[PDB]
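Teaching note: in complex prediction, the entire set of molecules is handled at once rather than each chain in isolation. The prompt given to students was simply: 'Predict the structure of this complex.' The entities are:
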Amino acid sequence: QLSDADKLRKVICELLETERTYVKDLNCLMERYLKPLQKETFLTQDELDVLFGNLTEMVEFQVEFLKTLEDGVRLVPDLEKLEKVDQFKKVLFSLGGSFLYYADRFKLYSAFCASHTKVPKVLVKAKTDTAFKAFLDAQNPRQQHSSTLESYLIKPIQRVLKYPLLLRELFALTDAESEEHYHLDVAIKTMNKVASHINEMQKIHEEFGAVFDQLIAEQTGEKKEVADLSMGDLLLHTSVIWLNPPASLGKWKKEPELAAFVFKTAVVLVYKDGSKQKKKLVGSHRLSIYEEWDPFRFRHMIPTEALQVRALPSADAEANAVCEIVHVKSESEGRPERVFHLCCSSPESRKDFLKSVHSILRDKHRRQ
Amino acid sequence: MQAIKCVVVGDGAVGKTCLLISYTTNAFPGEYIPTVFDNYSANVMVDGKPVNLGLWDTAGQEDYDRLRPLSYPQTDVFLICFSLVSPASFENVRAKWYPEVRHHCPNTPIILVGTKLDLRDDKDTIEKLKEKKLTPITYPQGLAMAKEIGAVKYLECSALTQRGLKTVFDEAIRAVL
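The expected output is the structure of the full assembly:
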């Protein structure tokens, strides 16, 4: 015969208890497997990078988030004494607060989720190198699956997505007319957006991760001027029309379309246009003649350091959806100016695109 | 020792988390059903063969089509669940879950678990569904679905009655061994 008060206390406790656990697991992953792996020859630097991945950043962040929860639950002497959900106002308020405050740093998870894509392929190397397999087992004495490296590296991805569930429970135990109720509802919508955002970021990574990687590496003789197009720094992505395409493309497609990405560290343009792997009725092999000319098409990365942006003036301005991204020239290095005339899908899109680009330039200015 | 990692998937509000808790805890949670189920691992013997059964819940990720499959790789058995008193969760087995799991895991055995068994012949539940021109899923239907998606087994259980749980995980393990 548990009262709403009891139920509420339960949820508040589950949230806090599981968070303490998660933080501990997070530290445990760091100490038990990752650090000791750096001091090894098993994996390459790249392989180690896939495993770690902003984890150190994630822990610092998570630790701070936990403190806020710890504090918030202490805004009252003893929850166990409260008999009315109404008596938890202070705590509910503070907890919900923690999510609103951290909602944005939680987007850092999309970074982890992107690299976790490479986790499987790397761990399936233990099946190969007896030496490596040996190390892992050594770190997992209890011979418990829930303690294997794969079990830890999935926890982050599970944890964020649990938050909205816990919140919806607190939500259901509060009067539909109260502010506590309304507040939680705000907390929930927020976190769902976080989740939804992580998902959207993943969808992008699935489709362009490859290209983004090629751009980071292959960095034209440069010694890594950017070296980092993390999904944690993607501020905005949109589809735009390339008005001034090279003669090859332009002469065949009136107005080619590019995928634009505004990262804190650069602006990326990528030509998509997909029409393959369609229509079962088709013969390729080699006697197909046409089709299959080259894997990729057009990609290009403009570092913030050389990124210049001017929104083109129009007769009927405020309605114009055109603007241009410029990859400034370089006397040294011997690199000519590159200009891209891009037409957004709408004035709002242009508004947001430019706002976004200016943003990375503004901040770049700060640091430098 | 050999580890079998089992991932329970399927529509939310089907009983997955409760089911996994009820099982691993040998006791229905009660009035308060926890939301979180940490990764579980325990030694289990089936048909004389000893194994470390690993269980991963998936609550909270059923709506994120790109995050959801991050747990799929290196999985030995999938438990595609669905509420016996929820025709919609049932239909998702063929429309969503099976196609997805198979796409990511071509060779992984699938046990089709039917949950909330105890609510199947519940007056209130049956009337509630009747009010929506609905009816609980019958064993014959569950079995057919199981056959359609080529599941290794079609079981039904109740985290409440705790009946059928042990079976569910044993068959899961057999499906692997």
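Point out the following to students. The radius of gyration of chain B is 15 Å. Chain B touches chain A at residues 1, 3, 5, 31-32, 34-36, 38-41, 52-54, 56-61, 63-67, 70-71, 73-74 (CB under 8 Å).
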